[PDB]
């Protein structure tokens, strides 16, 4: 998986920086030019998503009593189910990650900092393993960045 490790490192970092509230000081070295650009975009849009839907988000994080790793694998599924209607777009995609972030904050909050990495993987695994050909038809992370340019 060439352009998946690039997705993985994007989601892990956004989620880690959100949980830890501070930006990481090490360069994002396995996403390169393409992937660092989208992190800049993701930070921008995902923080608005989080801020715009803070109540909706909070409502859902409640219902999914989120503790161990299986709760994470379970959430992965919910996310798979989002796209069942046959529709794929970045709004969805980003919203999925923004929620990751939200949840990841909660995880560090409830002393489960180490469930944040399994969470990142599933999100990545969800998208890339289920929506490979949609992602590809958009020039991947480049499309993400051009969608949210504004």
């Amino acid at each position: 998986d060439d352009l998946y490790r690039q997705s993985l490192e994007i989601i892990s970092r956004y989620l880690r920086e959100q949980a830890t509230g501070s930006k990481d000081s090490k360069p994002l070295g396995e996403a390169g030019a393409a992937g660092r650009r989208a992190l800049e975009t993701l930070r921008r849009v995902g923080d608005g998503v989080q801020r715009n839907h803070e109540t909706a988000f909070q409502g859902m994080l409640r219902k999914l009593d989120i503790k161990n790793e299986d709760d994470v694998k379970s959430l992965s599924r919910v996310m798979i189910h989002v796209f069942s209607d046959g529709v794929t777009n970045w709004g969805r995609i980003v919203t999925l990650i923004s929620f990751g972030a939200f949840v990841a904050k909660h995880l560090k909050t409830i002393n489960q900092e180490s469930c944040i990495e399994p969470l990142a993987e599933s999100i990545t695994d969800v998208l890339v393993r289920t929506k490979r050909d949609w992602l590809v038809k958009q020039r991947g992370w480049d499309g993400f960045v051009e969608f949210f340019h504004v």
Binding site: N89, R92, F147
Partner: peptide, 21 residues
């Protein structure tokens, strides 16, 4: 996600941008 909340937010985030592009 009994009520399609995340999808519907996804689509709203997509709508707002669409109307911005």
């Amino acid at each position: 996600d009994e009520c399609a909340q995340l999808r519907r937010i996804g689509d709203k985030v997509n709508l707002r941008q669409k109307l911005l592009n």
